[PDB]
Amino acid sequence: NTQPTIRKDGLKLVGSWKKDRATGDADEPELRVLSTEEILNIFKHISVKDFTSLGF
Amino acid sequence: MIVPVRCFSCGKVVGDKWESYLNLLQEDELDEGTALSRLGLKRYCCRRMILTHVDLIEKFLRYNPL
Amino acid sequence: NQEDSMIMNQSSIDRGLFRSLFFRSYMDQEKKYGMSITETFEKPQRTNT
Amino acid sequence: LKYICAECSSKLSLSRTDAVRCKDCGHRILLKARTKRLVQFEAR
Ligand SMILES: [Zn+2]
Ligand SMILES: [Zn+2]
User: Fold this and answer.
1) Among residues 1-44 of chain D, which lie with CB inside 8 Å of chain A?
2) What is each CA distance from D18 to A3, D13, D15, in whole angstroms?
3) Of C4, C14, C30, C42, which residue is the catalytic one?
């Protein structure tokens, strides 16, 4: 999968999935608000050694 | 390419005898003549196919499928 | 049968006499001009081509 | 339920611009997964 670029606005986090997997360039990114629950879920899955690497 | 059914000449049910013919010719080492005769094919019309059929399907099936 | 013609049993044909398979194939692939301005393999819409 | 290649017949199920080569093996065959539809043939 492709990690979208993350931009900041007020108290929300948005991501730009450019995604370009069409034969044509298809410049059409998706601006989707990262729902906090999915961020919490993905954080729950981080390896313990990552914390040490990530300074946690 | 299995034994056909329904002799082109007559149409009698043929093919159900295939296993019997194969084994009979094998463990009893009789000639085809008596083999087909006891098989019960008096007319030669049926006789031709069982006489001159090649079951290619064996050579087919040797391939690992998929 | 006059003049080298012949007659064959409809019923025999029915039962399988002289039946035949028949195979045709087709060839196709993409094309390149760059700077890959290439074609595609997809159902074109009415208002496309 | 979209693509199968030779002798490692696992469901490839690739979609588009997605590394045509088989995941499992280095084959490049990819048979096209005969339809789930139904057909009519005549006994004759
Ligand atoms: Zn017969
Ligand atoms: Zn493979």
Assistant:
1) 16-18
2) 17, 10, 7
3) C4
